[PDB]
Amino acid sequence: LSRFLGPRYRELARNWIPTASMWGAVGAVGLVWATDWRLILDWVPYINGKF
Amino acid sequence: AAKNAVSQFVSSMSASADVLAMSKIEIKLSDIPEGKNMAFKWRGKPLFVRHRTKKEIDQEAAVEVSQLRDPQHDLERVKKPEWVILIGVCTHLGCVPIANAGDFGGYYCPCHGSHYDASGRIRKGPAPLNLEVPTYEFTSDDLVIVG
Amino acid sequence: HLVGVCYTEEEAKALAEEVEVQDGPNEDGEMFMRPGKLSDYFPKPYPN
Amino acid sequence: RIAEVDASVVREVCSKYFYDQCPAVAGLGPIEQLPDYNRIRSGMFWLRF
Amino acid sequence: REFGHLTRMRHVITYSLSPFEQRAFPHYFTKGIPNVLRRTRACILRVAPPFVVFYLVYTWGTQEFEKSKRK
Amino acid sequence: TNIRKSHPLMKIINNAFIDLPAPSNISSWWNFGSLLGICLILQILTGLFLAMHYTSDTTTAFSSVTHICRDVNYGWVIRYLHANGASMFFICLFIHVGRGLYYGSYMFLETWNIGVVLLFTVMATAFMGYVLPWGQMSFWGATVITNLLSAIPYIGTDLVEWIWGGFSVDKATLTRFFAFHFILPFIITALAAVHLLFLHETGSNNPTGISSDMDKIPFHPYYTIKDILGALFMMLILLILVLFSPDLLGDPDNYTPANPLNTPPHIKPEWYFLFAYAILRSIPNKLGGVLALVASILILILMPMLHTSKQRSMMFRPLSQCLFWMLVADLITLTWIGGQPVEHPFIIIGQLASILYFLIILVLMPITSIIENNLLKW
Amino acid sequence: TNIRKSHPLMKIINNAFIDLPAPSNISSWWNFGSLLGICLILQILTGLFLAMHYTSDTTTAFSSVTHICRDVNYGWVIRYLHANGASMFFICLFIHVGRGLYYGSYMFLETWNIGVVLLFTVMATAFMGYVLPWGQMSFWGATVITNLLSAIPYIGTDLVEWIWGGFSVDKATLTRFFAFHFILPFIITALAAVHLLFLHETGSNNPTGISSDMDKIPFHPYYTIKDILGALFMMLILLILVLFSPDLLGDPDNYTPANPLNTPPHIKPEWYFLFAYAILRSIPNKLGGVLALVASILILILMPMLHTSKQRSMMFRPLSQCLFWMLVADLITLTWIGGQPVEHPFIIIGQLASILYFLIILVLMPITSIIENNLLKW
Amino acid sequence: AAPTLTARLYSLLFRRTSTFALTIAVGALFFERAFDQGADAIYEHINQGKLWKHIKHKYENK
Ligand code: HEM
Ligand code: HEM
Ligand code: HEM
Ligand code: HEM
Ligand SMILES: Cc1cc(C)c2nc(SCc3c(C)cccc3-n3nnn(C)c3=O)sc2c1
Ligand SMILES: Cc1cc(C)c2nc(SCc3c(C)cccc3-n3nnn(C)c3=O)sc2c1
Ligand SMILES: Cc1cc(C)c2nc(SCc3c(C)cccc3-n3nnn(C)c3=O)sc2c1
Ligand SMILES: Cc1cc(C)c2nc(SCc3c(C)cccc3-n3nnn(C)c3=O)sc2c1
Ligand code: FES
Question: What family does the Swiss-Prot or TrEMBL record give for this protein (chain H) (predicted)?
Fold first, then answer.
């Protein structure tokens, strides 16, 4: 289609990819806290949460 | 409100055992004499211990390298030639046969034409890969910590 | 239940050894007897 | 002085004067649905950015 | 969405009769049979030919599994 | 005054079921929404009876199910109500989805997207319950899913040794299968209330596709009596199965207890999972198999944006109706192939019918609607 | 588009919790309604954990409760959360009722009458759960109720041999106690939603008794932050009991298994049933005992028509406030007497305080409000 | 009119509201680094020579 294409659509995407990778990287580091993701737990070894 | 209210609720039902010292802690005895595979009810499915004879080695090393499509041999996984540890599920679906039946000395799967060998080999289709070997460390002389 | 409280795991198998117990039925035998397996409760003191 | 103004100048000067600031409010009736001062002051910060 | 707020309509009249003034079965097997023969004639050529294709594949499929065995 | 319009509880009942405006030409294909709500309540009450006598332990799971069919009073009728009531749920659910697809009801966007979520949650619920009796199809059904669930690239093997309690199959293994299976039908109930709340904003579609505000009738008494009659005709058919053929839809191999050492001659799931199983075995890969299984339910959510016709329903579109029943006759083919063994004729037929399921929805349907627009000059 | 005011789900949340008009002078006695809703959710989640490991059989009931405190991981913290969370529920419930009685909140007639129903249903729920562990108070507590429940004149002995499964005491006995105790907390939840629906028609009362439509504030953020703070202060006190004194409120005699043979030295219920037990043992009859026990909860429903004062709350009525705390100091007396043995001093004190509980509510309070009207010249 | 050090973080991060809701995640770190120095070490100090790992060096001599 061309209802969404234009110089104004990815205009506000270029303003929101900083609000996007922050959409994604927070949820990506949110996915280790929940289910005790143990192959990325000691990605940085300062979190010795498992006793 | 997060680090101890979701992060600690797994063990009641998770990795942590409830019987603690139980079966991969045990002092495995000769709980089956030489040449059979009898069921035991621990680690879920029967780990099949077997007393290994003097000429079952050359059943396993006379077979060369080409058409067995998964290279995982018996000099590498289990540390002693006269010892072995097995798990009772196939790679694709999950069957193991009735004991001591087969053509050249393995376990013949009557689903649609398979036959697993003794120490975790497959000659047949449509099985993709070899047998699960269980975790182990032969630490002792004769009290078996398999896991 | 005494491993890490007042005894180690050795010193605890070797105390369960000290009394043999009455296990269940098997073929080519009877309900046989055997020493303690470290999964045993403390042995009871009156038949019934 | 008008020709120098562009979109990044306007975007910068508005953040200096508006963004997390305490405003002053006056009202003359009937004003029962004029929103609370806490709800007005929370309307100065944003949701996404 | 309630009844007196749905649409705007002008110049149409409706006549209706009470349920206690009527017969339960005026015509049941003297219009019920030729009206379903009209509704069946309208649908058949859109619905039936895909299921005649499942039949010819079932019949050929369960005939090349029998002759694979015993020559 | 009128207490139906001024009482705080009776107002909600009156706006939802009594004075609701409804189209006058609604067919009996619109009966199956309340039939689904009857089938859900039936599975909940019957399942709460079986859960007081079931034991989740792999040494006594098969024996606690034979005990209720022989010892407990009225346990045999309640057990076979539950197994046959689940086949009744899945046949009404497939009629319901095929209705909304033929008549263009997916244009109610919030109502259609809550429905695709509800379809996943009942399919996962029925899978967990068929593990619980622990015969030789509960065993070889559980392992086929969870070695296919170890082909998730980075967290896959983490998730397979969580559901068995940490392990292979033991006493604590079917406590997690049982607790999921207990909880999910009560989330299905909450998602079905939100489902109807979004439909109350527009009212119903009708077989012509054309809006009908000029022709509404009240819901009571015209569709309160028509829905009671269809529910009685459904309780008749269900009891014909419980009392005259209670083992017709099941498999005999699930009356043998689970044995890793013995061998089952074939692997056949329930009839309502047989179409998904045929799409799996046509992909020689184990990452591309679990992808194409999940993409066959998730393709329903693309139906609003694939619509290129000027009209809403298929009543006046004769070329789109030949393609609709080519798609139904293709899901019958995939149900037959899923219960056959894997040899030569049933291996090429199975993958040429997995291609046709995606070629009709994604390519042939949006092109056929544009040809119809052009023959009517829009 | 304000999406808080136009979305179909977000509208309901906004009208109920965000933009709700509330009085500005609401005290922390108005905190205990949401504390009761926290205590109910806590008892449901913790109870659903204990029900996967409990066994309802009189040979293995006591042994399945010792197993979870010793074998199952985190079973000891979850069991003592449940026993101590039930004392937390009953202390918030008695604060809640005493609030609505002092400030005159019973004038909301539909809200007050749903509340008296909710008080019966939580008292019956907590009775069934204390039977389930089967020690020597679960035994001698069950028989004292059900030989008092054979003194119903025409259907009494029909109902006592229904709840034990038909027999005296056996395995199928605690399947009926367990199934009632499972189901009733989910009916309590449905009655508490209807409870708040009728309060939404008027809004809240306030400590002065005077209507406050000229001084409303929004519920968010002023009482969303004040209710979160009171809930955190309640989770602190509950964990002081679970982690530093988990056996303070219970009785030691329930750690001995039930035996019709041995003998318990005393019969003492839980602290929150001790006031009703003292009214029972003051009536030398068994029909007039079960009547006066049920009439001590059902007297709350006469509070709207016993009100003879010109003002709504007790803030400006100093003689009605001396009678309000004479009634609280009389329920403390009846709690102490209910845990004492039946000898000479505790037998006349117990029946002179059962008379005073009915003399204050029915006679002395409506006469004192008329004297106050006359000293103010209405 | 020299003020006190309140506005460390009013301008940079806690103004865009980003780090106001992120401090539950970004701000989850290094306090289970810092409170073993509390509760655990206070616990073994009140009970000195009474726990198992105090006295276990005797029978652990192989
Ligand atoms: C447990 C599952 C479900 C229940 C209880 C349920 C219930 C209902 C009910 C009572 C109606 C109104 C009456 C009717 O038209 O039949 C309805 C309508 C509808 N449902 Fe469902 N449904 C369920 C699942 C689904 C699914 C899986 C879908 C689609 C993927 C769906 C989509 C729709 C649509 C689009 C409508 C409106 C149709 C129209 O008015 O033409 N629902 N549903
Ligand atoms: C949408 C709802 C449900 C569906 C589709 C469903 C489906 C099933 C199925 C297919 C089985 C296998 C039965 C067999 O073939 O022998 C089963 C078993 C079982 N289900 Fe359900 N179920 C539902 C709801 C529930 C609920 C709500 C409960 C409990 C509260 C429950 C409890 C049980 C129990 C205890 C078994 C034990 C095994 C047996 O009785 O065969 N079910 N369920
Ligand atoms: C499980 C039981 C209950 C729950 C969850 C509950 C919940 C609530 C909540 C959230 C409120 C509003 C906030 C507040 O004023 O505290 C409220 C108010 C009220 N409740 Fe309850 N309640 C319960 C039991 C009762 C009982 C037993 C009674 C009386 C016999 C009662 C009578 C009232 C009254 C009269 C009000 C309005 C008070 C006022 O605004 O001054 N409720 N309840
Ligand atoms: C308003 C809600 C509830 C109250 C006041 C309540 C109260 C109680 C009490 C006082 C006990 C005796 C515990 C003891 O002293 O040892 C008990 C036991 C028990 N309750 Fe609850 N309960 C509630 C909800 C539930 C629910 C919803 C369930 C299950 C789904 C449940 C399951 C159990 C079980 C299995 C036991 C026996 C195990 C044990 O004694 O710890 N409870 N309950
Ligand atoms: C016997 C019986 C009883 C009841 C109480 C009942 N209730 C429904 S749901 C009604 C509804 C709502 C709430 C919202 C939007 C649309 C519809 N609706 N409109 N047309 N049709 C066929 C619908 O179901 S079916 C049914 C059958
Ligand atoms: C969304 C979704 C989820 C799941 C998890 C799922 N699973 C299947 S196939 C499972 C199966 C096999 C492979 C073999 C034997 C029996 C069963 N089986 N298990 N339960 N039921 C009722 C069965 O028929 S499709 C499907 C779709
Ligand atoms: C933290 C928290 C969160 C929520 C979501 C919450 N919700 C309530 S219930 C609100 C209410 C309704 C729905 C209807 C009528 C009156 C009141 N209401 N009015 N004043 N007070 C003290 C009331 O509770 S408390 C509470 C506390
Ligand atoms: C509405 C209502 C209903 C019932 C049924 C009820 N019952 C009692 S007294 C029961 C009892 C006795 C006599 C002796 C030992 C222990 C317990 N007992 N049983 N459960 N709990 C928590 C106990 O303390 S007041 C009350 C009020
Ligand atoms: S099915 Fe396991 S070997 Fe073929």
Answer: Belongs to the UQCR10/QCR9 family.
CA angle D27, D30, D34 (to 5 degrees): 55
Count, residues in chain B: 147
Q: Is C2 helix (H, G, I), strand (E, B) or coil?
A: coil
Residue F252 is encoded by which pair of tokens?
Answer: 């005999």
Cis peptide before F221 (omega within 30 of 0): yes
CA F327 to each of CA E50, E51, F364, F370, G28: distance values in angstroms, whole numbers, following the listed order: 9, 11, 11, 19, 64
Structure's resolution in angstroms: 2.4
Q: Which helix (H) or strand (E) holds B14?
A: none
CB contact under 8 A, H56 and C5: no
Number of helices (H) and strands (E) in chain E: give both, helices first: 1, 0
- Judged on CB neighbours under 10 Å (0-12, 13-18, 19+), E71 is exposed
d(CA G105, CA G99): 8
Position G179, amino acid: A
DSSP C42: P
- What is B73-84 written as a DSSP string? -TTTSSS-TT--
Angle between helices G156-163 and G136-148 (to 10 degrees): 160
G295 lines ligand 8 (CB under 6 A): no
B28 three-class SS:
coil
Per the CB < 8 A criterion, the answer to whether F208 and F313 are in contact is: yes
A9 reaches D (C-beta below 8 A): no
Q: Which two tokens mark B147?
A: 């896991």
Assigned token pair, C28: 């080519």
For B136, the token pair is 């182990």
Q: How far apart are the first and last CA of chain E?
A: 72
Cα F215 to Cα D2, E13, F206: the distances in Å are: 62, 13, 11
CB contact under 8 A, A38 and F155: no
Torsion-angle region of B105 (φ positive above 0: left; ψ -120 to 50: alpha; else: beta): left
Token pair 């050894």 in the structure block, residue: C17
Would you say G140 and G129 are in contact if contact means Cβ atoms under 8 Å apart? no
Angstroms from F326 CA to nearest CA on chain E:
5
The Cβ of residue C11 has, within 10 Å, a number of other Cβ atoms equal to: 12
User: B107 forms bridges with which residues in the sheet?
Assistant: B101, B116
Q: How far apart are the C-alpha atoms of G208 and G313, rounded to whole Å? A: 6
Backbone angles phi, psi at C24, to 5 degrees: -90, -170
Chains touching E (at least 3 CB pairs under 8 A) are: F
CA–CA separation, G312 vs F46, rounded Å?
A: 50
The CA distance from F189 to G74, in Å, is: 31
Catalytic residues of B: 112
CA distance H29 to H27: 6
Q: How far is B17 from chain H (nearest CA, A)?
A: 22
**HEC readout, chain F:** CCHHHHCCCHHHHHHHHHCCEEECCCCHHHHHHHHHHHHHHHHHHHHHHHCCCCCCCCCCHHHHHHHHHHCCCCHHHHHHHHHHHHHHHHHHHHHHHHHHHHCCHHHCHHHHHHHHHHHHHHHHHHHHHCCCCCECCHHHHHHHHHHHCCCCCCCHHHHHHHHCCCCCCCCCCHHHHHHHHHHHHHHHHHHHHHHHHHHCCCCCCCCCCCCCHHHEEEHHHHCHHHHHHHHHHHHHHHHHHHHHCCCCCCCHHHHCECCCCCCCCCCCCCHHHHHHHHHHCCCCCCHHHHHHHHCCCHHHHHCCCCCCCCCCCCCCCCHHHHHHHHHHHHHHHHHHHCCCCCCCHHHHHHHHHHHHHHHHHHHHHHHHHHHHHHHCCC
Q: Which of B85, B70, B75, B80 has its CA nearest to residue B135?
A: B85
Q: How many residues does chain E have?
A: 71
Compute CA F251 distance to the chain's CA centroid, rounded to the nearest angstrom.
20
CA-to-CA distance for F112 and F194, rounded, in angstroms?
12
Structure tokens at B23: 């079966």
Q: What residues of F are annotated to the active site?
A: 200, 204, 226-227, 270
Tokens 């393609």 — which residue?
A: F323
